[PDB]
Design a protein around this ligand. Sequence first.
Ligand SMILES: N=C(N)c1ccc(/N=N\Nc2ccc(C(=N)N)cc2)cc1
Lengths: 186, 186
Amino acid sequence: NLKDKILGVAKELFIKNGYNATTTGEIVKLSESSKGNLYYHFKTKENLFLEILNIEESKWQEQWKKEQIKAKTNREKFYLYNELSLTTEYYYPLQNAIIEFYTEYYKTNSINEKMNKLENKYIDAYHVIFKEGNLNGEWSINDVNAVSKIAANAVNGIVTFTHEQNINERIKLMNKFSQIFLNGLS
Amino acid sequence: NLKDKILGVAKELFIKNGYNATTTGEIVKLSESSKGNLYYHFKTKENLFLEILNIEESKWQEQWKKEQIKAKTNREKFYLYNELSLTTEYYYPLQNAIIEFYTEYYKTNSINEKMNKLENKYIDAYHVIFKEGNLNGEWSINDVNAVSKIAANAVNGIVTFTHEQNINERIKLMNKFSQIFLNGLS
Ligand SMILES: N=C(N)c1ccc(/N=N\Nc2ccc(C(=N)N)cc2)cc1
């Protein structure tokens, strides 16, 4: 709990003021903890942030798990998951601190390491969809892992580098993509 | 040179660090110049940055012109463009910085105007490729502009969120993408 309290307050601090501006000092006092406790649990702000990202990652899976029920077939799960990724991030408060964190620790392979363990989790989503899709003759892919890293990053790029147009156009495009992509698998 | 020497340093700081990560003070102190210098050419930081992007963009589209000749069909031009994006030292290595600048300056329409004019060069390459492919009868695209934006963004995605993996593993994925994508266009 004192650990959970820290992660909760930290999450809010990062949202209201960003990664860089937020100090462990603030986190320490606001969660009524201590530098020692914070160190014992996370060692560094970087690690603390990675753990928040971890928790967020879990919630996203939990969400997806109950959200994918609206998609009977994997084809649909592909469509839905990509659309969800696009819409939910449009209003994800932590997104900014993440940008800040990423573009701040992508030079050090230290933190860059644990981040892939994290990204892998986001790719599993696809992995499952593509594997499951195979065992249902929805398509036939022999290099799942591959196609999965692709869908993951292709989708993230569409979500990340299309910031300017109205939300409908985006969803329209993202869907066009899921269509094209799922078609090139046949 | 002077102006051109600034652009050179800034370009490095924007990559080696980030948009926000680097300030007008750094660029100056690390160029033997002084504060009250940048004006007629570099009035503001957002101006200096947008300038760098303009450069890198044109240096890349040019390299592509002097390299796409090795691709007889447009099908091959697509693969080729996507592969090179992984190896070039232009534009793409500044995507991280762009992301920040785009999510922290997409309000003042004074930017989104010029900022988006730069987004047309980005998707143009695919525009030409996809459009020409229609004439060359290699495929049948109706919503070229959409596909171009989609391909462009999808690719930037595979390029940006994999910069920490075996450079050849990347080429591999990217090629699998190009394959998957084009096969979907028909
Ligand atoms: N195949 C991967 N390594 C991979 C998989 C999933 C993934 N997901 N998101 N990545 C990601 C990367 C950067 C940002 C950002 N700060 N703009 C946001 C998200 C990123 C990378």
